Symmetry: D2
Subunit: 242 residues, 4 copies
C-alpha cells in the first residue's frame, strides 16, 4: 500500500496558472517512492495537464466523469477520453457534485462501475455535514453513502475512498485526528478490504498534515484549497514522506 495524496484543484487556474504550477512543482517534487501523487485539474485543462504528467511521476486525475462511453449527455466527459489522456484516477461523488449538480448515489454507483470497467482508479467521496455530526449519525450517514454507492461491485479493493466531511462553516479542523482515525476505521470495516486507500479530504494543510497522516487508518489526503499553492503542497508532501 502506497499513500495516495491527491490535489483537487476544483475550478481553479487559467492555462498560465497551470503551466506555472507544473513548472514549480515538477522541478521540485522528489517522486517519493511511497507516495502515489495525483493532481486533478479543471476538466477543460486535462489535455494540457496530460502533456505535463505524461513524463512525470505525477498521476493525472479527473474531477468527474460520466458513466457512459458516449451518448447524448451534453456537457459531460467520457471515460474513453480520460483513458486516452492517461488519467489514472477519477474523483467520484464529491460533495460539491451532490449539492449543486444532481449527483445521486445511483449515478455514483454507475460511475464507479464504469471507472473499474475502464481501469480508472475511482476515488469515492463520502462525508456527513455538520448537522449530521451533531445528531450523532456521522458513521450511519457514511455507511448509507458507501453501501448505495458500492452496491453490486464485487472487487472493492480497486476503489479508494476520500472521507470528505461537509462543512458550510470553515474551521481549519473539520474533525479531530482521533475522530478521523475512528471514522477511517469504520469505513475500512464497511469496505471489508485492506488494499483500498482511505484518504482524509477534510481540512488538510501544512500545520496538521503530520498528526493526520500519522493515524494508521489515514492512507493519504485529498487536498483542495491547500493544493493550489505549489509550495504549500510540496511542504505537505515532505511531511508525508516524514
Amino acid at each position: 500500500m502506497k499513500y495516495l495524496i491527491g490535489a483537487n484543484f476544483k475550478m481553479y487556474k487559467s492555462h498560465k496558472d497551470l503551466q506555472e504550477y507544473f513548472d514549480q512543482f515538477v522541478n521540485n517534487y522528489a517522486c517519493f517512492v511511497n507516495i502515489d501523487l495525483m493532481i486533478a485539474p479543471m476538466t477543460v485543462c486535462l489535455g494540457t495537464a496530460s502533456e505535463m504528467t505524461k513524463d512525470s511521476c505525477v498521476h493525472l486525475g479527473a474531477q468527474n466523469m460520466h458513466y457512459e462511453d458516449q451518448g447524448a449527455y451534453t456537457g459531460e466527459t467520457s471515460p474513453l477520453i480520460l483513458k486516452e489522456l492517461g488519467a489514472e484516477y477519477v474523483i467520484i461523488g464529491h460533495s460539491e457534485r451532490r449539492q449543486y449538480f444532481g449527483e445521486t448515489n445511483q449515478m455514483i454507483n454507475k460511475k464507479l462501475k464504469s471507472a473499474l470497467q475502464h481501469g480508472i482508479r475511482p476515488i469515492l467521496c463520502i462525508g456527513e455535514n455538520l448537522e449530521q455530526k451533531e445528531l450523532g449519525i456521522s458513521k450511519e450517514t457514511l455507511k448509507i453513502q458507501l453501501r448505495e454507492a458500492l452496491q453490486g461491485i464485487d472487487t472493492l479493493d480497486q476503489i479508494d475512498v476520500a472521507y470528505e466531511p461537509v462543512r458550510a462553516i470553515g474551521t481549519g479542523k473539520s474533525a479531530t485526528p482521533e475522530e478521523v482515525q475512528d471514522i477511517h476505521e469504520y469505513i475500512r470495516s464497511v469496505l471489508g478490504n485492506e488494499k483500498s486507500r482511505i484518504i482524509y479530504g477534510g481540512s488538510v494543510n501544512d500545520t496538521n498534515a503530520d498528526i493526520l497522516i500519522a493515524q494508521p487508518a489515514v492512507n493519504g489526503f485529498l487536498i483542495g484549497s491547500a493544493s493550489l499553492d505549489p509550495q504549500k503542497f510540496l511542504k505537505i508532501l515532505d511531511v508525508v514522506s516524514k
Copy 2:
C-alpha cells in the same frame, strides 16, 4: 444577421475521431459568408478543438459552463478558460442538463449573465416535452423558461436561442415546419429583439434542412446527432447556403 448553425457533438468522439472530423471538415467547408459556423465538442477536448478552430472560420462553442470565474465547483468549467481557448459560443440550459444534472432556470440565468460579462455569446436552449405539447402548453412552457432564464438581463440582443423540443420518442420530425415557424415567431416576440438568432434544435437532418431554414423565423440550427458525420453536416451547410 447571419445564420448560426452549430454542431452539438454532446459526449461523442475520441481525440482521433475529432482530428479526423476536423480534417474532413476544414478541408471541405467553404466558409460561407452568411453562416456563423459553430462546433461544440466534448468539454475535455476543447483544448484540442481550440488548436483546430484558431486558424479556421469555425467558431469554437462549449457545451456547458459554470457561472463563477473560479471556486469550489468540482468538475465544473470556468468561463475564463473558455475565453482563453477562443470559445465564442456556449450552450446554456440544454435539455439534457435540465433532465440529468440539476440545471435550473436560476442557474441558467447566472450562466447567461456570466457569458455576457465575459463576451461569450450564449445559446439558450428551451423546449417543451411531448406531454406539454399534447396539453397545448408549448408556447406557455417556453415563455416561462425564457422569462426566468432572461430575468434581469438588459441587452437580450447578445443572446441567441435554440428551440429544442424535448422528445423521449424519436420521430425525425419533432415538429412540422409551420409549427417551428409559429414557435419561433412567438419566441421572437418574447425576446423583443430582431438581432437574436432563434435556431431550431429539433430533429434536423439533410432531408428537411431546406424546408426548415426556409421559414423566416428560423435563423439557423443547433444540430446534434446529424452533426457527428462530417459529410452529412456539410450537406446541410450546403442546403443552408442555398
Copy 3:
C-alpha cells in the same frame, strides 16, 4: 342567467366544535338562501360530522377542504370521498395553494382527486394561482394555464368543475376580470364557475362580482365571522 354564483367559506384550520355551532346557528337561521347563489361552507375535516348535522334541511351546501382520490385503503390520515358523500358533502376544495407548498399536492394528485370527486358527484373547486415572482416576471397567465391543463387532463366534462383563482402571496378588479376571462378560455366552457379567492370584503364584493368572468368568491379568514360573511352575501345580493 345560465349561472348560479358560487360563494364559499374556506374556514381552513379554524374554529372549535363550539365556534362551529355558534356559527351555523347564527348563519342558517339568518341567511336568505338567495336563488342566484350556491352557498358553500368548508369547515375543518374533523368537524364535518357536526357541520353536516347542522345543514341537513338547509340551503347551505357542505364543502370539504381536501380529500383523497381512493374510496378506501392504506392511506393513513386521509379522508375518503365515500365518507364525504355519506355526510352530504357537495363540494371539495382541491389543490389549495397551502397544500401545494406544504403537503405535496402535485398536479398529478390533483388530477386524480378531480376525477374521483366527479365519479362521486362531489363538485370540486380547483385552486389555481401565481406567486409574486411569476406576476413580476409577467407569466401569470401562462402559469395558470399550466396548472389548469395538468390538473384537467383526460377529464371530458370540464363543466362539472369550478375554479378558484387566488394570487399566491405572503400573509385590482379589472385585473381579476382579465385573469378570470383568460381562465374561462382555458376551461373552454361557460358553465364552470370561476370564483375569486383573493381579498374580498364588503367594500369590494359588489364591484368584483359585477365582472362577467367573476362568478363568486372563495373566502378565507373574512368568512370566519358569520355577520361578515352575511354582509358580503348581501352586497352580492345587491
Copy 4:
C-alpha cells in the same frame, strides 16, 4: 413492570360512520380493559367526533392518524391539535410511511408535530421503518437511526414519545427484537414504548410480545375486524 404495553388500531382510510358504530359497540362492551395494556384506536379523522362520543367513559384511548403542528391558521385541509385535545384524543400517529411517500411528511415536519403533540399532552407514535432496498443493502439500522435522530432533535423528554417500527414494503421475531433493541438504544430510555407495526396476527402476537424490546403493536387492516382485534389482545393477555 415499569411499562404498560401499547396496542393500537390504525384503521387508515377505512370504515363508514356505521361500520365505526358497529365496531365500537361490539368492542367497548367486550374488551376487558387489561391493566397492562394501553389500548388505542385511530379511526379516520372525519370520524373522530363519532369515535370520541363512543369512548368517553371507556378505557379505549382515542388516537388520530395525523395532525398539524400549529394550533390554528391558514392550513387548508389540516387538523388542529386543539380540536384533537377537545375531542379527547390521547394519541397521534406521526410520520406514518404512507404520509412520507405520498403526502410529503419530512423529518422536519414530523419534528414540529412531535413537539406540538408534547406541548398539548397528546402522546405521539413516531413511525419509522426501512424499505426493502435498505434491508437488502444491510443498512436497516442506520436508516432508522437517521429517521429517529432527525425526528427527535431538540426534544428533551424522549420518554413522552412512543415508536412504531414497520418495515416499508409493497402490499422474524428475533429480527424484530434485534431491531427494537437497537431502537431502544437510539431512544436512550426505557419508558418509550417500541411497538411493532409489521404483520401481527393471533398466531404470532404472543411470540412477538414476549420479546423484551417489543412493547406492543400498531395494527393495520387486521384491526378492522373487532373480533380479530379482540383475539389479538387476548393472546397478548396470555
